[PDB]
Amino acid sequence: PEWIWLALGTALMGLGTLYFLVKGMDAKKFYAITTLVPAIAFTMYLSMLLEQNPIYWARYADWLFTTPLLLLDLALLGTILALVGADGIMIGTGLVGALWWAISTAAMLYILYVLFFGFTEVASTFKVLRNVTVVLWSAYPVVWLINIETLLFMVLDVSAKVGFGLILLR
Amino acid sequence: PEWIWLALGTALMGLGTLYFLVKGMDAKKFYAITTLVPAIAFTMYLSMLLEQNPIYWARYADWLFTTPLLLLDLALLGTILALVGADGIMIGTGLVGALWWAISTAAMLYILYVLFFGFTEVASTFKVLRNVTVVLWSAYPVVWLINIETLLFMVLDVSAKVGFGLILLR
Amino acid sequence: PEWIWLALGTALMGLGTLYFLVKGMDAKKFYAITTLVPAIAFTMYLSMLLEQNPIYWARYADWLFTTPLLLLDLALLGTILALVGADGIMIGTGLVGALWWAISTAAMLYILYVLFFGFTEVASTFKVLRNVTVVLWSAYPVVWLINIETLLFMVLDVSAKVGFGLILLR
Numbered sequence A, B, C: 001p002e003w004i005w006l007a008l009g010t011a012l013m014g015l016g017t018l019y020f021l022v023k024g025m026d027a028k029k030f031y032a033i034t035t036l037v038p039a040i041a042f043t044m045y046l047s048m049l050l051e052q053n054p055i056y057w058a059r060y061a062d063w064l065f066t067t068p069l070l071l072l073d074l075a076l077l078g079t080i081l082a083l084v085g086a087d088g089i090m091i092g093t094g095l096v097g098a099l100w101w102a103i104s105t106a107a108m109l110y111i112l113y114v115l116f117f118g119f120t121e122v123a124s125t126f127k128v129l130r131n132v133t134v135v136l137w138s139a140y141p142v143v144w145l146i147n148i149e150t151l152l153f154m155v156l157d158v159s160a161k162v163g164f165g166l167i168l169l170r
């Protein structure tokens, strides 16, 4: 069941890498960072594609890595390290749990709140970015607690990133 | 048995994060770094709290991470990377063993000796720091070889860090 | 069978660390980096020494770590991050497989091609380096697909690194 959605997903991700790379062929820093997310996402996305116990983690792993990257990206334009700890915390939990979350959410707020504090066309970018990220991530804890698991999540990352990447080109 | 001590421990660690964070609300760099240790320590400390095989590693994992941080912190005020290798070496061993140490100790001396070479109120700080660290870590290999396992270790980290953090505020 | 070769290997690696360290007692950066490879190689090399499933990974793990280091070293004199992803990809695969490669090779070309683009006595160094690396790594995918597994690989790392390190002193 979960698979229908997943195959879709991996496909899209790869594209991202192709596109960005292609496109890419201060400014110097961005291409790399933004390119790193889709590619990483793609490999782990396909990794995942390729009952309950095993599938879960991959997401976490990919998520882990793309997260700081995403956050770094955002901040780029201790703070930094703090965020990853949280994320690391989070994966521990979920995996711990079906195979804790309380603190994860605490940590999430931190990142979110810092973002808020932090930023306050580049301006445009961060403005949109902050809200984009906020709402985007909400599905995680929301869904977590909540065909669907996979579905939703799929949307989210692609939405999150591919959309996100586009902003940079913009 | 081990638990009595452990619950105690996690509690204290969390405090650290609260306090520092709170307090925090060149100087810029320190808060982050110092704040990162207690928080990380707390999460993994609680992770551990939450027969022989499983418990062991967590310590290692947390230890791993707080170590370079601690060392980085100290140096902050290749060198760097070398140290983590050692630490990584160390975890490999202990986990390998009950679930090698010889080289670990070799590596430990390196860090210790470098510290010595390195530093030779900031001055005060490093002076105390070096000896603090030296003696502190000695229990590890000492204890390792040696209720008690957990007990001692508990003391050590808190002693090591919470005390350590305090120095920075100072 | 594999062991004969392996014991040989670990021995040589350790030497490297001793030598470099010893020797070492812009220039500042190199010693560290170059010293880090042999030592790391040695620990994991011995780790490996100390039927099919278990042995494999260690190599990967060590490989993982020495790789970016090696690459970083080369570049030192996003780019950076990209490369590790690939490597990470690669380990996933091989381990996935006997315990994917297609993309690994794709990634390898990237590193290789970037090198090419990148560099185009320091000059000498990179010139030789690029070809050295290219041919060296070819055995990996070659052998992978291909007493021998262990044999060949052994040669390669030592050849790769110990030789490589020497270049720096040079």
Ligand SMILES: *C/C=C(C)/C=C/C=C(C)/C=C/C1=C(C)CCCC1(C)C
Pocket: A041, A062, A063, A064, A066, A067, A070, A087, A090, A091, A093, A094, A101, A104, A105, A108, A137, A140, A141, A144, A157, A160, A161
């Ligand atoms: C490309 C994917 C990205 C950028 C994913 C980011 C994910 C998070 C911040 C997930 C957080 C989670 C928690 C709050 C812990 C338990 C529930 C989770 C796992 C969904």
Ligand SMILES: *C/C=C(C)/C=C/C=C(C)/C=C/C1=C(C)CCCC1(C)C
Pocket: B041, B062, B063, B064, B066, B067, B070, B087, B090, B091, B093, B094, B101, B104, B105, B108, B137, B140, B141, B144, B157, B160, B161
């Ligand atoms: C907050 C905790 C910290 C900063 C811990 C640091 C720990 C070490 C340097 C442990 C080293 C160990 C060895 C020498 C290998 C086998 C014996 C160990 C594991 C205790």
Ligand SMILES: *C/C=C(C)/C=C/C=C(C)/C=C/C1=C(C)CCCC1(C)C
Pocket: C041, C062, C063, C064, C066, C067, C070, C087, C090, C091, C093, C094, C101, C104, C105, C108, C137, C140, C141, C144, C157, C160, C161
């Ligand atoms: C000191 C050892 C070093 C620097 C090793 C570097 C290794 C690689 C770049 C290995 C790549 C591999 C693939 C192309 C994936 C499946 C086949 C492998 C595993 C050999």
